[PDB]
Amino acid sequence: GLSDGEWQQVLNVWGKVEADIAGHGQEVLIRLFTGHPETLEKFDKFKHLKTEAEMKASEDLKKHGTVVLTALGGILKKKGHHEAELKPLAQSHATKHKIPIKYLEFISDAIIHVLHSKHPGDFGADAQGAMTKALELFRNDIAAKYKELGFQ
Ligand code: HEM
């Protein structure tokens, strides 16, 4: 449950991401994969990436980063009214990709890390609070769908 002012902060922060969705998406995934190498194993199409240099050079990783952040941005712009947008992602990530909710926590924190890394001094405490709450809401609603599906 975010206030109007918190959603305003979220969407203000998101404008930073939308200016360079592929660069943000790439860095989010690289942060996820390098911080939590087990997550790489969930991607048949990225498990060949042995080094961060290879990850950085991967155009397909940037492409997927764009897909991920485009989806997330579409969800965030719903300001919590995202059941229709979230449902297929929860279902695909539980049933097809088999992504534990822990990895969604990892990527949520990776987003925060990337925002500070790319916008140092420009991702204020209020913005971090609002973005964190929005990612918690996202993760929590996914978690509810995971529970429905019995997925761990
Ligand atoms: C912000 C959180 C995430 C968003 C918005 C997101 C979004 C997406 C989207 C839109 C797709 C393609 C459509 C689909 O298959 O449903 C996808 C595919 C996929 N996602 Fe995610 N995802 C997120 C987090 C994760 C995490 C944390 C993992 C694993 C650690 C993961 C693993 C995968 C895999 C393996 C695929 C299939 C990739 C392929 O083979 O093309 N996702 N994701």
Side-chain angles (χ1 to χ4, degrees), residues 106-117:
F106 291 165
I107 202 173
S108 292
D109 285 340
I111 286 164
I112 298 297
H113 183 88
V114 167
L115 289 169
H116 279 302
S117 176

Side-chain angles (χ1 to χ4, degrees), residues 29-40:
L29 292 178
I30 290 176
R31 174 65 176 183
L32 178 70
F33 291 159
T34 58
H36 310 277
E38 71 271 34
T39 62
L40 190 64

Side-chain angles (χ1 to χ4, degrees), residues 28-29 32-33 36 38-46 60 64 67-73 75 88-93 96-108 111 135 138 142:
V28 169
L29 292 178
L32 178 70
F33 291 159
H36 310 277
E38 71 271 34
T39 62
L40 190 64
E41 296 307 316
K42 293 288 178 179
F43 292 86
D44 289 324
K45 69 179 183 189
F46 299 134
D60 200 52
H64 197 63
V67 170
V68 170
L69 291 193
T70 295
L72 184 58
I75 286 164
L89 289 183
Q91 294 192 296
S92 70
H93 285 62
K96 183 159 201 317
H97 309 319
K98 293 178 159 51
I99 303 314
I101 193 77
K102 186 69 170 179
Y103 296 0
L104 293 171
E105 177 191 359
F106 291 165
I107 202 173
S108 292
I111 286 164
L135 293 173
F138 169 74
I142 292 179

Side-chain angles (χ1 to χ4, degrees), residues 4-107:
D4 297 327
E6 289 172 323
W7 281 119
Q8 192 181 303
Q9 296 266 13
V10 170
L11 296 180
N12 185 259
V13 172
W14 198 252
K16 296 171 151 40
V17 176
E18 295 207 327
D20 177 16
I21 191 131
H24 283 84
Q26 178 194 55
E27 294 193 28
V28 169
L29 292 178
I30 290 176
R31 174 65 176 183
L32 178 70
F33 291 159
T34 58
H36 310 277
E38 71 271 34
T39 62
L40 190 64
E41 296 307 316
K42 293 288 178 179
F43 292 86
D44 289 324
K45 69 179 183 189
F46 299 134
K47 60 185 192 300
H48 71 282
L49 292 166
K50 293 276 96 197
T51 65
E52 184 174 345
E54 288 167 344
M55 300 180 187
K56 205 84 71 181
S58 175
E59 300 300 336
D60 200 52
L61 187 153
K62 268 181 57 172
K63 179 178 182 173
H64 197 63
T66 298
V67 170
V68 170
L69 291 193
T70 295
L72 184 58
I75 286 164
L76 290 178
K77 292 177 182 202
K78 301 300 299 297
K79 297 168 58 183
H81 300 284
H82 53 224
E83 166 75 14
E85 292 79 11
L86 189 136
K87 180 177 212 181
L89 289 183
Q91 294 192 296
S92 70
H93 285 62
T95 68
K96 183 159 201 317
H97 309 319
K98 293 178 159 51
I99 303 314
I101 193 77
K102 186 69 170 179
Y103 296 0
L104 293 171
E105 177 191 359
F106 291 165
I107 202 173

